[PDB]
Design a protein that fits this description.
2 copies of one chain form a homodimer. Chain A folds into 2 domains: 1-80, Glutaredoxin, CATH 3.40.30.10; 81-221, Up-down Bundle (Glutathione S-transferase Yfyf (Class Pi), Chain A, domain 2), CATH 1.20.1050.10. The first copy, chain A, has 8 helices and 4 strands. Chain A has a 4-stranded mixed beta sheet with strand order 2-1-3-4, with helices on one face. In chain A, a hairpin with a 2-residue loop joins β3 (57-60) and β4 (63-66). Chain A has helices at 13-25, 44-49, 68-79, 90-120, 128-144, 157-169, 181-191, 196-220, and strands at 4-8, 29-33, 57-60, 63-66. Chain A starts with a strand and ends with a helix. The first copy, chain A, has 221 residues and is of the alpha+beta class. The structure holds glutathione (GSH) (2 copies). One glutathione is lined by residues 10-12, 34, 39, 51-54, 65-67, 102 of chain B. One glutathione binds at residues 12-14, 36, 41, 53-56, 67-69, 104 of chain A. Chain B: Residues 87-208 form the GST C-terminal domain. Chain B: Its EC number is 2.5.1.18. Chain B: It catalyses: RX + glutathione = an S-substituted glutathione + a halide anion + H(+).
Chain lengths: 221, 218
Amino acid sequence: MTKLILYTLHVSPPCRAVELCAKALGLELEQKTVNLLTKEHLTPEFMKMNPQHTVPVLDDNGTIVCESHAIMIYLVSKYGKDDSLYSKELVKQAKLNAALHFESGVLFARLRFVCEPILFAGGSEIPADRAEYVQKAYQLLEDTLVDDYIVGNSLTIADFSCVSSVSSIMGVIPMDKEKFPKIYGWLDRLKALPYYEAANGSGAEQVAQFVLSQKEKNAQK
Amino acid sequence: KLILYTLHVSPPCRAVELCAKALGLELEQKTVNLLTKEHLTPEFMKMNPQHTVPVLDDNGTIVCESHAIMIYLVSKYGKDDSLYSKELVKQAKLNAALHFESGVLFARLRFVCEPILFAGGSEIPADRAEYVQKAYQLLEDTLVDDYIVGNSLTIADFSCVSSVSSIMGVIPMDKEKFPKIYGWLDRLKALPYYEAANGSGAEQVAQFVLSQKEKNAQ
Ligand SMILES: N[C@@H](CCC(=O)N[C@@H](CS)C(=O)NCC(=O)O)C(=O)O
Ligand SMILES: N[C@@H](CCC(=O)N[C@@H](CS)C(=O)NCC(=O)O)C(=O)O
């Protein structure tokens, strides 16, 4: 059997969402690291796989699947032993899709608006409005957490997506525990997963440390 | 019937309008004026804690978020799956495109427009305009076929066109740099319901942003 290949970078939040999902599904990924600093994502071959030139990208026996949310849905749909991680039911699926688009359109987008300029454009200071954009995202997430998980009272791929970015950005933009108790309670649930630290926690800590290090290098230049 | 809590100038609302027209559905549109904070009432927070439009009410079934709404409508009301495939591989291509729209096209549109519309902004910072230019290039490269995914119309087209048609009225989209985007726009514009469901609101929102920008400068 052809083993699954993930074009990936462990410090990348969307890549870690897929790693979490693969662990939950009992899948083993062959990880191929893609160095963005040396433009490994901008080779002709990579751009052929993904014209938007982002990681993660999955190669499943020749079938190329781009984009973390799409990859997770694909993996649950194809390999899941049940639909617990991503419901096939019309209404619950719609709740999950809404949450996944909140992650791409709000959580990750705003994370990137803060981190990208530091990592790729010599940024040495985070503009106040962009930090506040993230604070606003924390509040939106806090209000989304009406139940134990992002959607309902059991773990789903919406949790993997949201935690991958929240765990990263909270190491750069302070997330006040007195303001957002539900986010921290939810993080605690996810941290109890045996695969959480290896699939996500480690890389979330690593990326925040890298962002802060680069920001300081840039400031001290 | 089908109720949409909506604002015609809003790109994600117009994506749903396009989708409903394609499905032959009639929406009862209930306007929510974001400018006067009608989205921040307790009742609206009840339907959607993230306080955004669009929200669909389908005989009491509440569905938030434009992409989720379109998938829901096609799944429940489509005569077939043309607009959103149930097949594993094509569905994944569609999902990737929909998340490109939310995470890149709409996010960057909002990063330009929101400060002007809601925060008294009178400027578009160079870096944010450039962020949109980069989005145009990403879209141009995504268009390897006649539509966003494949060679027939899907909800990924509705999502992407709703935001592209809006932001191009604020951040110039050079036809010499982006010929494929223009070719694709023409395919969407040829739909008999395009102007009513999307084109009009796209023009209105661009005018709104430019007008407010100048008012704020005074
Ligand atoms: N919506 C995408 C976002 C992917 C993304 O932006 N990945 C970043 C790494 S965190 C990347 O590859 N950037 C390279 C580039 O944008 O050129 C997903 O969830 O897969
Ligand atoms: N991903 C959401 C985005 C919705 C969204 O941001 N809508 C804007 C109008 S264009 C809004 O309701 N803003 C009000 C707010 O953020 O409080 C979707 O596609 O439905």
